[PDB]
Amino acid sequence: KLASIDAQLRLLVPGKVSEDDKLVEYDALLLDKFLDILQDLHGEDLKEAVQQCYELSAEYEGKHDPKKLEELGSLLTSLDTGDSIVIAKAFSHMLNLANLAEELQIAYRRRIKLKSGDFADEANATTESDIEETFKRLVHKLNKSPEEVFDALKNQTVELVLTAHPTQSVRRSLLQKHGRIRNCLAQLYAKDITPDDKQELDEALHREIQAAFRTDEIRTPPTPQDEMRAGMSYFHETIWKGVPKFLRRVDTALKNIGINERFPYNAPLIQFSSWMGGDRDGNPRVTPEVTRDVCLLARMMTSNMYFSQIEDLMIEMSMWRCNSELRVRAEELYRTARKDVKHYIEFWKRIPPNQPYRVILGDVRDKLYNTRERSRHLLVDGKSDIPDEAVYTNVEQLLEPLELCYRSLCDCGDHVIADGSLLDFLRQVSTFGLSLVKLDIRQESDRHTEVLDAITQHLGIGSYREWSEEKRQEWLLAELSGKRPLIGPDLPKTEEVKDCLDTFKVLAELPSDCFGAYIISMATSTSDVLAVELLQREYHIKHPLRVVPLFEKLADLEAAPAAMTRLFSMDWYRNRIDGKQEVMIGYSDSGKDAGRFSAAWQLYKTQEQIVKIAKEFGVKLVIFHGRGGTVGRGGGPTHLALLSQPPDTINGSLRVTVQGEVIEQSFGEEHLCFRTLQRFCAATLEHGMNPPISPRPEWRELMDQMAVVATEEYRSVVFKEPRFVEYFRLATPELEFGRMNRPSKGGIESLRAIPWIFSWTQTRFHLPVWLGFGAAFKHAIQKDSKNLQMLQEMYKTWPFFRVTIDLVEMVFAKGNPGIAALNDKLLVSEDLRPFGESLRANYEETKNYLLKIAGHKDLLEGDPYLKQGIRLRDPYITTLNVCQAYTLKRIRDPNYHVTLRPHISKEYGLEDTLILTMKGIAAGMQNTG
Amino acid sequence: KLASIDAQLRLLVPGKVSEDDKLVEYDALLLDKFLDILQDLHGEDLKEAVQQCYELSAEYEGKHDPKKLEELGSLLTSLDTGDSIVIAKAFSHMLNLANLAEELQIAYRRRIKLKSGDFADEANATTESDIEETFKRLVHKLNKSPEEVFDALKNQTVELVLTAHPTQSVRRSLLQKHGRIRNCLAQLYAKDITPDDKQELDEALHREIQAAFRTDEIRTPPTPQDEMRAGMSYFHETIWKGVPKFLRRVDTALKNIGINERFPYNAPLIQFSSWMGGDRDGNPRVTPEVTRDVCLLARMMTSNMYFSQIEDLMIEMSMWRCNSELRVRAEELYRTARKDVKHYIEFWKRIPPNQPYRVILGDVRDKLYNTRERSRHLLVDGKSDIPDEAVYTNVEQLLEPLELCYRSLCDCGDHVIADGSLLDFLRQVSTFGLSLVKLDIRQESDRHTEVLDAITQHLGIGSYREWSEEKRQEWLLAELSGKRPLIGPDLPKTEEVKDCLDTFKVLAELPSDCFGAYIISMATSTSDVLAVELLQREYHIKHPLRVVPLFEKLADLEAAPAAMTRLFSMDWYRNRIDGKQEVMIGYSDSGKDAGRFSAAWQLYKTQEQIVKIAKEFGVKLVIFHGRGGTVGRGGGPTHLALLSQPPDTINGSLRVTVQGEVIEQSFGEEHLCFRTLQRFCAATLEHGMNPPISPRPEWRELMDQMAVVATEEYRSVVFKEPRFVEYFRLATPELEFGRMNRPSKGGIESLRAIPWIFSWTQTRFHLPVWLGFGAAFKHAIQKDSKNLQMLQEMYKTWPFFRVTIDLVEMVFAKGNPGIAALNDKLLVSEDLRPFGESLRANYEETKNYLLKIAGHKDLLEGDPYLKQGIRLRDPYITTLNVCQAYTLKRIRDPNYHVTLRPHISKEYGLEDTLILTMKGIAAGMQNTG
């Protein structure tokens, strides 16, 4: 029964069910159908086993009786390889279904009608300000005129940079199955459904769930080209159409505040970018050829998407009334027109001149087609005979005939028609250009040092690497105005040096609209930035990429201001950057060095300090937000996170990472996609005209004191404990993540931020996110009892503090120290168990101080809808945690034996199970630190 | 205001508004937006004029005060050419909008839950039996087993033959605009609409209405190729997808009566055919080249439609598990696979062998593409180098790889997935084949006589035309077993004779799956059918088309049985037709000869008589229903019409005309499309197992007596009144319909049935539908007062009689003798006005007898939803009737002058106005006789 499954699920999540709360119902219906499918595909016995795992896990999540985890363990460790794989597949699949259901629930959850106005309303999707409410607050509360608001938005840019799913790039095919499951589900709850439609939707739902489950081939890692193409799927699914839907909402909002024009179609309000095939930091599989291929793939896809919708527009543009300008152009094209068959779906004969818009758009289609085919031949054959004037090489060439269509309609009395699909198409072109994402390159500073050292030594003038910072600067500036090239044809090159040089060669050869920033990982100094500038000059790149330092460690953040000041003082550099500089911060990176509490506070300060330095030098600064920050959460929390930024750090230009493990939530469902674009646009606009409060001096002082203590605790555990590393390798699947791939790892310091966060997320322990907050809180409270109240006032009143605590609280809600205890017991040697125990004691204490500061008795009592979503996924994740724990034992320990049950599944090893459990646990945990 | 427009509209149609009745609301909203658009495009003044015409017409339709028609006349006759055209365009457009609204209302009108079981429930869409209810009645009331019902449906065929819109083939582009207006409208009434969505849908609705209005270019008639392509648009809009949606409902219904398999994908339950480019009866513009072109166009479109959906199926069919058979075929195709770019939207690189279903479907796509391109080159270049094994020449070749995909899924445990899009695709292929319509040829008997007369005289053996029927038969049978060809290279040929011979040449050259029946217009005799058989033999056509006589006049219907008996007695013919014969009837044709009452009754008898003769000779008979019958109404009335057929006249095979003026209603909106397919399938099934009652002898006798009297009255008015023709030319726009084109016209007898019906429909008088019923009723009632009760019992109890009266009653509801009176007064000479008056007196008397027999006080009190729809269109049609009447005066009468108002419209002769009024009046009247 459905009702019995509803019953079990409902016990897991008490709450106050009104009509729009269907999430438990959705999950029951999906689980019920998936169980039928399992019985069908694999037999009743296997179905009963899955059920039993689910039941035991759900009971355990109810009362947390250890006994239920043991029974779950006994069952799971008795399964053979074949049955283990089916079970891990089953539970992974259920997590995806649950996520789709949750998306549908967020999409249809009722908006709160009367918002209290407190900034806390912007943390929650049901309460946050939409774009019109944002306009109205600025007008009526901050006394901006409608014209000032309109003018600021017209000059605003929001750039979202997509990074790779750290664990499982989802293929286009499966994504589309997920979308259809989500739709069947929505339609089953449509008002006024006939019984036959319900029966047929039911069978469709069943069929899709099965199709997705059976898309499950398990040998080779995915190539970076395939990872990029997978990572681009969301444009087709939602973003492509989502952009003009949101820009049309902006028109509507403008109209409602008394602005009587549309948002200009070519204002570059939204821009997407990518790191897929561009980031080679610690990753030698990202070669110059990879980068070339992803640029051409992005070009091929973009021109293909315009091509694949142009015929629809041609069909609509049947109108025969046009202006002179377009008439003349149409008759030109008509006279030079081919007498014969074009192998297209729709307009295959010659287009007659009384269909003038079709004649214009017919020529655009041919260009799009050739533009697409050139890219394809360049990818597959290594070059192309297709000439430049047969294709679009600049976006202006594509806009022009569309603009001509627009004006001609306007001039003939049809403005209204122009503002339909034509306007949407113009906006798509202006937003995606000829490459729907611009690609950032990233490489670490030491690689550039190595390249330049090879050059200096071959020149016989010494060793760049040995040179002091002052001497580096001096030589770099001399060569940046040099009169001859640096690199001769006999320069000796190691493979790494060659690889780095040849990247610049790809940058010089490809069009500049393929590229965004050149990010320098591990940047520390002025010379790091000049080094990249010299290499671009040496390759004579016609439009050099802007060079963007990423300062990672705490010490690097502290040295950033002097580095930026020095750059800005240099005439060559000032002239080169033309009033603009972008700097990147990496929350997870900095947090791996110094603990998340101190990284958060330091990043607040460093941003303040760089903003001031930029003003002083008359430079416009963009802060590029790397992964791990409150702004990377997605959903409503992102809205308040953005508003929490230090004053003047946005200033009309937002650039943020959309982390791969967040892209599905942010963009998979069309309503969420629309809301995601909206909150980025609204928050960015608001912040420049309505900064949060600046902190009280007492608050800064306490933050400083707390950071010293947090950093000390985090570093004594992570870096000074001589056996932390050995513990970490036993308690987490960190090593196995490595040997089943980027590459991952000199200890934790040389371990990358993603494997660090990921490994502890897998054990439901999350040490990287919380460690250090505990000592900070305790020390503050014990030094002066009054600090408890100060910290509570900061939570209630200082948006930065509020969002910083909320993220840690969400992570604690995804935690379970029973899973970590189980891993200790199974996997850690006896002499290191006390260490694990003492970390669990810190977890508890740190959680409780956080709760006390937030004024909560229970985790997430602020946010019951989020808590509900996390709780409904828990039983699935827990089953995977237990399966994984015993799998790791079997893999590691040739001594370990258990009696195996006879094979359960019909139809009609260990490493594979582990990869399944790792991916499913990650899909259920989504973002943390 | 919207509310004020709602108010006026509501007065027109009193009734008992529950929540699902929104039609008045829809019409108000559409008119309100269209008025804004008129003001915008053409100025406030013109908007006020339109409004004023609408207001005056709506008032007139309320109380029928003559004064309101006069004022409407004064206003309209004062407009210049430019303003007249804008006004006629405006009112035509509003009629289309109203029709779209009505469609949406029929689609969402609530079903009656408890049906009374009376056959009268099958006349109305809210009460008719759906396919499952049909199954259940057969099982529980007629004691059929589920298996017997399943088996009869599996052997059933429903063939729908599409004919050309008699007045305005609507182009694809405009059709799609209409669809989007209909959707915006539906979405504006969606439950739980946000205000911004409502504002944006509103602006979208406005924009579409404008786009459709401005698709309005007015020189050349449309070529028959363009008329056919226009006429095929409904496949893309609804029928293509509608077929598998209905066949899936059949699966569901079967399951619900205990049949646990799907309806076989290749049972040929549904077949579409066409006359567009095949009918040349009285139409010399339909040449052999036209026929060749429409066959190739149908082939091109069909393969294009499969091509344009195959990539979607490829995307879904990502599964890697396949059986041996498919594995082997995939590895074959993979080895012989091209290394390089295919210029397709989706799978442009070589498909890998671990995507086996994609490999199979990739090869299908290439074949589809080549099949499509061959047809295109044959059309545009006159031939093609594309060889046979590069394309599909038979449908089996396309089914085979799809069947292989199906089996492989089933064999690997994925039956459920197979039954999704794959199953739909299989059904589409089985239903549309390689030519989505098969083409009937039609030509009149006398043309074949003329051809054979040329042959006999060139041979020196006499004149076929002078030969008696017996001598014709004798010679035809001798030559049908002849040993040498008839036609030598020097046969003298007039253009007509050549044209007729060359059609046979096209039939011999093209594939047989392009063609259906060869219909003989004006058939009278056995030799007429043998004549066509001899010509096909002479051209050595490998699969000769079946020859189908159309017996038109009453005398021809009476001679049909002896003609069929003689054919069936001839061994050569029996052997040729292999147990099957199709005969055609033409309701409108027969009604033009003898009056509609007598044609209806005679057609009932003739069908009975031919059915019996077929049984006796062991031949299966199909009766092909031509236009003008109760079965051509569309909507629910069609359901009872089909059930009304004489016993055994369907017998598992239905063939009916879908008239061009009905196609929009039947197929334009996806729910109506689904319901149309459903009632054809359900009624055909039911009838063979549940014939209506056969009439009582007293009823036959009275029907006979009534026919003698009806025919006499109809013929004395139409054929024996020496000035009827002269009256008809003045009172109707018949002549102008001619000189603005098929061709149209020896008096009424040589006038074609469509111009006859059409001309009287235009004046809202409809003489062809009702004339004769009056004398029949009166004579019956006056001969014996008891006949009134007999006729009422027939109405209540005899489905044939009931449906025959209902059609005439619907036509009276579309009538208005005020419009005919106005035409008399304006257009008819004084000495013929009394004639017109006496016809109006007959109209009134005939209507009243009909009402009395039906037991109604008011027209259509049976069917208030239909009455409501007709009444809401009336004001628009009336404005066009008045405009037309004065336009015809101006065109005909150089003496007629009126003072013209200064030009009203901004922006930024007579013949054109007339064509607009004629098309709009026809679109508002839809089907009558």
Side-chain angles (χ1 to χ4, degrees), chain A residues 912-927:
Chain A
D912 296 307
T913 298
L914 184 60
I915 291 157
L916 289 164
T917 70
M918 284 189 313
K919 285 174 189 181
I921 288 157
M925 294 272 103
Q926 303 177 164
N927 52 297

Side-chain angles (χ1 to χ4, degrees), chain A residues 200 214 249 252 344 376 412, chain B residues 200 249 252 344 376 412:
Chain A
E200 285 152 17
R214 301 278 274 187
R249 177 59 43 81
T252 299
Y344 292 136
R376 284 173 178 183
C412 292
Chain B
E200 285 152 17
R249 177 59 43 81
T252 299
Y344 292 136
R376 284 173 178 183
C412 292

Side-chain angles (χ1 to χ4, degrees), chain B residues 851-890:
Chain B
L851 287 173
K852 205 153 214 208
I853 285 171
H856 301 160
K857 261 278 196 288
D858 307 307
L859 291 165
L860 292 184
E861 73 173 43
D863 197 348
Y865 298 140
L866 180 68
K867 186 180 172 90
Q868 178 185 235
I870 293 178
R871 291 293 168 256
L872 292 163
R873 293 177 227 141
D874 279 336
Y876 310 111
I877 301 181
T878 290
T879 298
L880 298 176
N881 290 128
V882 177
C883 181
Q884 181 158 293
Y886 285 94
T887 304
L888 288 165
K889 195 166 182 58
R890 287 178 162 151

Side-chain angles (χ1 to χ4, degrees), chain A residues 41 89 130 132 171-173 176-177 180 194 196-197 199-200 203 206-207 210-211 214-217 229 248-249 252 255-256 262 297 300 304 307-308 315-316 318-321 340-349 354-355 358 369 372-373 376-377 379-381 411-414 416-417 419-420 908, chain B residues 41 89 130 132 171-173 176-177 180 194 196-197 199-200 203 206-207 210-211 214-217 229 248-249 252 255-256 262 297 300 304 307-308 315-316 318-321 340-349 354-355 358 369 372-373 376-377 379-381 411-414 416-417 419-420 908:
Chain A
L41 287 175
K89 275 178 182 167
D130 69 16
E132 182 177 327
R171 59 183 299 177
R172 186 257 316 257
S173 173
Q176 289 182 359
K177 294 175 169 67
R180 291 189 296 280
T194 72
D196 298 318
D197 299 349
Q199 197 167 347
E200 285 152 17
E203 128 201 334
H206 181 95
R207 172 185 310 123
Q210 181 162 335
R214 301 278 274 187
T215 307
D216 68 346
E217 190 173 29
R229 192 189 351 255
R248 190 174 300 280
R249 177 59 43 81
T252 299
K255 214 205 64 140
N256 295 347
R262 296 200 175 268
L297 280 161
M300 190 285 286
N304 195 30
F307 176 81
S308 68
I315 292 167
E316 296 191 15
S318 59
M319 30 276 336
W320 65 270
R321 287 166 196 96
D340 49 60
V341 184
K342 286 156 175 198
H343 315 132
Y344 292 136
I345 293 165
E346 288 302 344
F347 289 93
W348 61 271
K349 295 221 260 48
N354 69 329
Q355 293 168 21
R358 293 182 175 168
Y369 172 89
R372 179 247 259 164
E373 294 309 300
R376 284 173 178 183
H377 281 109
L379 278 158
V380 164
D381 314 327
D411 289 359
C412 292
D414 288 310
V416 158
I417 298 173
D419 284 343
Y908 207 78
Chain B
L41 287 175
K89 275 178 182 167
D130 69 16
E132 182 177 327
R171 59 183 299 177
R172 186 257 316 257
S173 173
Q176 289 182 359
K177 294 175 169 67
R180 291 189 296 280
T194 72
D196 298 318
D197 299 349
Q199 197 167 347
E200 285 152 17
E203 128 201 334
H206 181 95
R207 172 185 310 123
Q210 181 162 335
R214 301 278 274 187
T215 307
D216 68 346
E217 190 173 29
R229 192 189 351 255
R248 190 174 300 280
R249 177 59 43 81
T252 299
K255 214 205 64 140
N256 295 347
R262 296 200 175 268
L297 280 161
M300 190 285 286
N304 195 30
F307 176 81
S308 68
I315 292 167
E316 296 191 15
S318 59
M319 30 276 336
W320 65 270
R321 287 166 196 96
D340 49 60
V341 184
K342 286 156 175 198
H343 315 132
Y344 292 136
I345 293 165
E346 288 302 344
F347 289 93
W348 61 271
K349 295 221 260 48
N354 69 329
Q355 293 168 21
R358 293 182 175 168
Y369 172 89
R372 179 247 259 164
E373 294 309 300
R376 284 173 178 183
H377 281 109
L379 278 158
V380 164
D381 314 327
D411 289 359
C412 292
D414 288 310
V416 158
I417 298 173
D419 284 343
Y908 207 78

Side-chain angles (χ1 to χ4, degrees), chain B residues 671-683:
Chain B
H671 302 88
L672 311 199
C673 165
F674 179 102
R675 290 175 201 156
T676 289
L677 300 176
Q678 181 172 237
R679 68 176 58 95
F680 280 123
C681 287

Side-chain angles (χ1 to χ4, degrees), chain B residues 264-338 340-450:
Chain B
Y265 63 84
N266 63 353
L269 180 62
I270 297 177
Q271 165 77 59
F272 288 85
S273 294
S274 177
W275 275 25
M276 293 175 265
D279 183 14
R280 54 211 80 216
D281 177 25
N283 194 1
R285 293 177 35 177
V286 182
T287 53
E289 198 47 54
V290 164
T291 290
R292 179 180 165 275
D293 287 358
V294 304
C295 288
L296 297 166
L297 280 161
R299 180 69 45 103
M300 190 285 286
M301 290 163 47
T302 306
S303 52
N304 195 30
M305 283 173 201
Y306 302 129
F307 176 81
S308 68
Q309 77 188 18
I310 192 75
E311 286 177 13
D312 287 335
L313 183 69
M314 287 164 74
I315 292 167
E316 296 191 15
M317 295 285 289
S318 59
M319 30 276 336
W320 65 270
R321 287 166 196 96
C322 64
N323 71 10
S324 278
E325 197 187 359
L326 187 153
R327 176 68 70 200
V328 172
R329 181 91 60 93
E331 263 142 27
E332 265 156 43
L333 287 161
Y334 181 73
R335 177 199 53 256
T336 51
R338 305 184 23 183
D340 49 60
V341 184
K342 286 156 175 198
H343 315 132
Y344 292 136
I345 293 165
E346 288 302 344
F347 289 93
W348 61 271
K349 295 221 260 48
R350 194 198 317 146
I351 297 155
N354 69 329
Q355 293 168 21
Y357 297 92
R358 293 182 175 168
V359 174
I360 302 307
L361 295 177
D363 176 69
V364 177
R365 176 176 62 167
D366 293 340
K367 298 285 173 47
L368 297 168
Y369 172 89
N370 296 339
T371 305
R372 179 247 259 164
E373 294 309 300
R374 186 151 96 181
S375 285
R376 284 173 178 183
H377 281 109
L378 288 169
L379 278 158
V380 164
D381 314 327
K383 43 38 173 172
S384 186
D385 55 10
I386 298 165
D388 273 21
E389 42 283 328
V391 312
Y392 293 123
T393 45
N394 186 80
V395 61
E396 217 56 51
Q397 301 171 298
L398 172 54
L399 279 167
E400 193 280 334
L402 299 171
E403 287 166 329
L404 172 69
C405 290
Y406 191 90
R407 271 177 261 127
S408 178
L409 289 172
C410 285
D411 289 359
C412 292
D414 288 310
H415 192 160
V416 158
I417 298 173
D419 284 343
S421 342
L422 184 55
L423 181 55
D424 287 351
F425 199 128
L426 281 162
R427 286 163 158 176
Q428 288 165 323
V429 172
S430 173
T431 300
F432 308 113
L434 300 175
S435 290
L436 42 28
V437 291
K438 292 177 177 336
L439 184 72
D440 282 355
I441 305 304
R442 189 172 71 153
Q443 178 58 282
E444 75 179 288
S445 46
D446 188 70
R447 186 65 70 83
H448 308 127
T449 299
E450 185 74 354

Side-chain angles (χ1 to χ4, degrees), chain B residues 687-741 743-744 746-835:
Chain B
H687 183 271
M689 289 179 264
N690 191 24
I693 51 175
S694 275
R696 310 185 60 106
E698 324 83 85
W699 299 352
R700 293 190 180 264
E701 197 180 34
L702 183 65
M703 289 295 299
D704 286 346
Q705 286 164 10
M706 290 194 283
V708 171
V709 166
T711 291
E712 164 68 28
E713 173 182 48
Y714 175 91
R715 294 185 182 155
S716 52
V717 163
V718 172
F719 297 110
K720 295 194 187 63
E721 261 300 342
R723 296 187 81 180
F724 177 78
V725 159
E726 183 187 344
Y727 176 73
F728 175 50
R729 294 165 170 173
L730 297 161
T732 77
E734 176 262 310
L735 285 173
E736 287 86 357
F737 177 99
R739 315 203 219 82
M740 293 159 169
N741 60 116
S744 292
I748 303 310
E749 195 267 19
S750 74
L751 184 76
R752 299 187 64 86
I754 281 158
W756 180 237
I757 299 306
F758 171 98
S759 286
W760 288 113
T761 295
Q762 287 279 311
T763 58
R764 315 281 293 287
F765 194 57
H766 316 286
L767 175 157
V769 173
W770 56 268
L771 182 62
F773 277 82
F777 296 148
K778 173 157 62 172
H779 187 268
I781 288 169
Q782 292 181 348
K783 172 140 137 281
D784 183 348
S785 47
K786 282 153 301 204
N787 286 154
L788 173 56
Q789 294 75 53
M790 191 187 291
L791 290 163
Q792 289 165 337
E793 282 154 17
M794 292 155 69
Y795 178 83
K796 293 200 207 83
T797 281
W798 184 20
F800 159 81
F801 198 70
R802 163 69 69 112
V803 300
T804 292
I805 295 308
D806 288 351
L807 179 151
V808 184
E809 192 178 1
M810 172 273 288
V811 175
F812 279 126
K814 295 178 173 177
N816 175 2
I819 298 305
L822 165 71
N823 288 299
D824 266 27
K825 189 203 179 187
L826 289 179
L827 303 177
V828 175
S829 44
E830 187 182 293
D831 60 351
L832 289 171
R833 280 179 208 125
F835 188 61

